[PDB]
Design a protein around this ligand. Structure first.
Ligand SMILES: C=C1[C@H](O)CC(=C/C=C2\CCC[C@]3(C)[C@@H]([C@H](C)CC#C[C@@H](O)C[C@]45C[C@H]6C[C@H](C[C@H](C6)C4)C5)CC[C@@H]23)C[C@H]1O
Lengths: 11, 240
């Protein structure tokens, strides 16, 4: 679904 | 009797928790102020509290041994479906049985049943949430057991969407063993009686809370005026 923010908090 | 690796894990989690959970709750002052004057008067402040919380749980999950080895998409599924649960779990550290509430260093940042009701929440949600907090508190878990329970909750294999369950479960198992071994070694009686059974159960209660409190979310976000008062992260993680 594309989670830019959640994805950025991980990386 | 706790291998060296199991002490490694325990230390990791305790430190990870420490770097993601501030007991002075200083940042709480950067949230949109609370209003108890007024339907949903507490939606902005809690929206922000939860959003902040979603972040700390994400930062906490990254420090879970073996969690990084997970695929990107899996890491998304686990945090997206555990966040609310872990928030509720980690929130037991500020929950007091005195007046049944979440105390955070001051009355202004002290949330009671009626403050949660001001965020658009009936008792059909609150009643169980409180039962939970009380039951979980009664356990008097050690910080070790506390941080392990959260980690184990995040790396659950049966979460819908998981693609590499086998790998996730392997991450969980390692964690469970560390908690079971720990409950045997560092937790004396009657402080470790079915301690592991009552805990796995608290995980089941959580799933029940999730289900219930997620439907309410769709009922609240379904109205653009209400959705309009949340944060981006909350909308991303909790769905949009
Ligand atoms: C840093 C900490 C501290 O211990 C303080 C803390 C307290 C937790 C609390 C006290 C207030 C009420 C909290 C948010 C509970 C929530 C109402 C349960 C829920 C839910 C869902 O509908 C999501 C949601 C919750 C609220 C109100 C609206 C809009 C958003 C903000 C999203 C619906 C869960 C944990 C509780 C959270 C923890 O992470």
């Amino acid at each position: 679904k594309n989670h830019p923010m959640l994805m950025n908090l991980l990386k | 009797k706790l291998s060296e690796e199991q002490q490694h894990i325990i230390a990791i989690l305790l430190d990870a928790h420490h770097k993601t959970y501030d007991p002075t709750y200083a940042d709480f002052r950067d949230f949109r102020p609370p209003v108890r004057m007024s339907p949903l008067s507490m939606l902005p402040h809690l929206a922000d509290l939860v959003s902040y919380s979603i972040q700390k749980v994400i930062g906490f999950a990254k420090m879970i041994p073996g969690f990084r080895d997970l695929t990107s998409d899996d890491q998304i599924v686990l945090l997206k479906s555990s966040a609310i649960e872990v928030i509720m779990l980690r929130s037991n550290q500020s929950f007091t049985m005195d007046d049944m509430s979440w105390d955070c260093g001051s009355q202004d940042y002290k949330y009671d049943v009626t403050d949660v009701s001001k965020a658009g929440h009936t008792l059909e949600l609150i009643e169980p949430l409180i039962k939970f907090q009380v039951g979980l508190k009664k356990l008097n878990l050690h910080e070790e057991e506390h941080v392990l329970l959260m980690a184990i909750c995040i790396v659950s294999p049966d979460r819908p969407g998981v693609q590499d369950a086998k790998l996730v479960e392997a991450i969980q198992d390692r964690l469970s063993n560390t908690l079971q071994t720990y409950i045997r070694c560092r937790h004396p009686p009657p402080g470790s009686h079915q301690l592991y059974a009552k805990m796995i159960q608290k995980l089941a209660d959580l799933r029940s809370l999730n289900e219930e409190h997620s439907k309410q979310y769709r009922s609240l976000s379904f109205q653009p005026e209400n959705s309009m008062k949340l944060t981006p992260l909350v909308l991303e993680v909790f769905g949009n």
